């Protein structure tokens, strides 16, 4: 419904993930990430189809039509304010911090390389956008755990909600923390499928089991930047109930992203051959309209 889409974009959305006492059978391997699958909720139409349309556009035109709506992403700062977090850290054990943080998103950028228009040209099709790119979920999504000691929160901005890897990663955190929540804030980019995981109330005892497995596979107790690569961690699929719980949040995001990207694509392919069109006006209005009732 259009009512749910508007409120999700204008107010944000979130879900509370459950806690699992048992960690699934861990099997870390670095280099290759698991491919998306139907059991994990892969959906070309909802998650890829409109993204593939924007991929064919030349990036010079994509930058012109997204110039006004590419606002600085500040959803991590918004979370720090709500949680009354004073200081944060990414690593290290010699400083005090309220939370350990990792930011895997592509902040303030939408595409990887400048590229001309594509007439699908071998039927070919590498994704140039930072949207629905499961390759963005590198192994540094677990770096906060290497130096997690007495901190209260583990905050991670996920770069995507697409693929099996992100669901497997959230299943692990739901065994390492007893309070895990997925967030997509208003001040986050609603052109990309990014989100924020907020986890608290750490379960130290199976956190040690996880880090013990990671240290044995990586053959190192400290973090190594050479391991900022793709990976898989779980063998058998996770609970279907947990997948559907993730998809409840995931669907709401991709429902709104489809409307946002359809407006952008209709504006760029408008018969008026201009940025001044009915689609661009609704797109700029929905995203750039001030929340005056929250401040003034």
Swiss-Prot record:
The organism's place on the tree of life at top rank: Viruses
BP-aspect Gene Ontology terms: DNA-templated transcription termination
Subcellular location, principal: virion
A GO molecular-function annotation: mRNA 5'-cap (guanine-N7-)-methyltransferase activity
Entry's localization field: Virion
Keyword Metal-binding part of the UniProt annotation: no
Claim: Transcription is one of the keywords in the record: yes
Keyword annotations of the record: mRNA capping, mRNA processing, Transcription, Transcription regulation, Transcription termination, Virion
Alphabetical list of InterPro entries matching this protein: Poxvirus_mRNA-cap_ssu (IPR005009), Poxvirus_mRNA-cap_ssu_sf (IPR043096)
Entry GO terms, CC: virion component
Protein purpose: Acts with RNA polymerase to initiate transcription from late gene promoters.
Family indicated by similarity: Belongs to the orthopoxvirus mRNA-capping enzyme regulatory subunit family.
Name recorded for this polypeptide: mRNA-capping enzyme regulatory subunit OPG124
Organism, scientific name: Monkeypox virus
Native organism taxonomy: Viruses, Varidnaviria, Bamfordvirae, Nucleocytoviricota, Pokkesviricetes
Chain's gene name: OPG124
């Amino acid at each position: 419904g259009m009512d749910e889409i508007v409120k999700n974009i204008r107010e944000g959305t979130h879900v509370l993930l459950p806690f699992y006492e048992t960690l699934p059978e861990l099997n870390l391997s670095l280099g290759k990430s698991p491919l998306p699958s139907l059991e994990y909720g892969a959906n070309y139409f909802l998650q890829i189809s409109r993204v593939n349309d924007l991929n064919r556009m030349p990036t010079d035109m994509l930058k012109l039509f997204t110039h006004d709506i590419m606002l600085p992403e500040s959803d991590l700062d918004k979370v720090y304010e709500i949680l009354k977090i004073n200081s944060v850290k990414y690593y290290g054990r010699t400083t005090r911090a309220d939370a350990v943080v990792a930011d895997l998103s592509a902040r303030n950028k939408l595409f990887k390389r400048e590229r001309d228009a594509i007439k699908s040209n071998n039927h070919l099709t590498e994704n140039n956008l930072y949207i629905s790119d499961y390759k963005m979920l590198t192994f540094d999504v677990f770096r906060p755990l290497f130096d997690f000691v007495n901190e209260k929160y583990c905050i991670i901005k996920l770069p995507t909600l697409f693929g099996r890897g992100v669901i497997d990663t959230m299943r692990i955190y739901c065994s390492l923390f007893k309070n895990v929540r997925l967030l997509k804030c208003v001040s986050d980019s609603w052109l990309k499928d990014s989100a924020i995981m907020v986890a608290s109330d750490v379960y130290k005892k199976n956190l040690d089991l996880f880090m013990s497995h990671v240290k044995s596979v990586t053959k190192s107790s400290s973090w190594k930047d050479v391991n900022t690569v793709q990976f898989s961690i779980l063998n058998d699929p996770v609970d279907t109930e947990f997948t559907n719980k993730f998809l409840e949040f995931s669907n709401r995001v991709y429902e709104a992203l489809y409307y946002v990207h359809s407006l952008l694509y209709s504006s760029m392919t408008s018969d008026s051959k201009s940025i001044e069109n009915k689609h661009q006006r609704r797109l700029v209005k929905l995203l750039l309209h001030h929340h005056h009732h929250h401040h003034h």
